[PDB]
Amino acid sequence: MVDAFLGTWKLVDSKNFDDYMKSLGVGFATRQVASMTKPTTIIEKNGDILTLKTHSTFKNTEISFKLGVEFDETTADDRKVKSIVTLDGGKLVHLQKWDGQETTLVRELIDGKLILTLTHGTAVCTRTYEKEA
Ligand SMILES: CCCCCCCCCCCC(=O)O
């Protein structure tokens, strides 16, 4: 049951995103622009296929996947990763693997807001999105 995640979401708070980007090896100029962007995330379904768009003034991304089925992904910072997205405890958990590394992108609904927790290494970033009508 992915349905309450679906829709258009706007970033309204971000904590420790620079730490997360730095842990991934993102260069300073890119972190600097990304620290001031507020993306829009769009999550849509068609049958078993989810599509997750991230739009901004800086980078855009789009992925499509089936829950529980691995897919190739090229991230906004140009990592080529092996990904899987699954529901776990009602949370949408996206795991990326590359070069023996991993990062998790966990989305949880709290009081109607979409909380995205990004973990790589020891860095833990929390970014809050609010629904657009
Ligand atoms: C230009 C962005 C560079 C850093 C990308 C890091 C990996 C994706 C982070 C996604 C964050 C979000 O969806 O709010």
Can you tell me the distance from the alpha carbon of 125 to that of 48, in angstroms, rounded to the nearest whole number?
29
96 CA to centre of own chain:
10
> Which pairs count as long-range contacts for 30-37, CB under 8 Å and 24+ apart, including other chains?
30/77, 33/58, 34/58, 34/59, 37/11
Experimental method: X-ray
Annotated binding site for hexadecanoate: 127-129
CA–centroid distance, residue 59 to ligand 1 (Å): 9
Nearest CA to ligand 1 atom 4: 77
- Residues 40 and 55: beta-carbon distance below 8 Å: yes
CA-to-CA dists, residue 51 to 17, 43, 78, 100, angstroms:
23, 6, 19, 26
| Rounded distance between C-alpha atoms, residue 67 and residue 84, angstroms | 7
Q: Which residues are annotated as a binding site for (9Z)-octadecenoate?
A: 127-129
Classify residue 111 by its DSSP letter: T
Strand 61-66 and strand 123-132: the pairing is unpaired
- Token representation of residue 58: 């800086």
- Which residue type sits at 97? K
Q: What is d(CA 50, CA 36) in angstroms, rounded to the nearest whole number?
A: 28
Closest atom of ligand 1 relative to the 58 alpha carbon:
1
| Tokens, residue 98 | 């590359």
Ligand 1 centroid to Cα of residue 100, in Å, is: 20
Rounded to 10 degrees, what is the CA torsion of 98, 3, 63, 71? 50
Range of the domain at 122: 1-133
- Scanning the structure block, which residue is given the tokens 């140009």? 78
Per the document, the length of the chain is: 133
> What span, in angstroms and rounded, lies between the C-alpha atoms of 76 and 85?
17
Q: Which amino acid is at 81?
A: V
Strand order in the sheet with 80-88: 61-66, 49-55, 40-46, 7-15, 123-132, 113-120, 101-110, 91-98, 80-88, 71-74
CATH of the domain at 37: 2.40.128.20
Q: Three-class SS of residue 27?
A: coil
Taking the CA of residue 76 as reference, the ligand 1 atom at the shortest distance is 5
- Residues near ligand 1 (Cβ within 6 A): 21, 26, 30, 34, 39, 41, 54, 58-59, 75-77, 116, 127
The secondary structure of 42-108 as a DSSP string is EEEEETTEEEEEEE-SS--EEEEEETTS-EEEE-TT--EEEEEEEEETTEEEEEEEETTEEEEEEEE
Three-class secondary structure of residue 125 per DSSP? strand
| 125 CA closest ligand 1 atom index | 11
Q: State how many domains the chain has.
A: 1
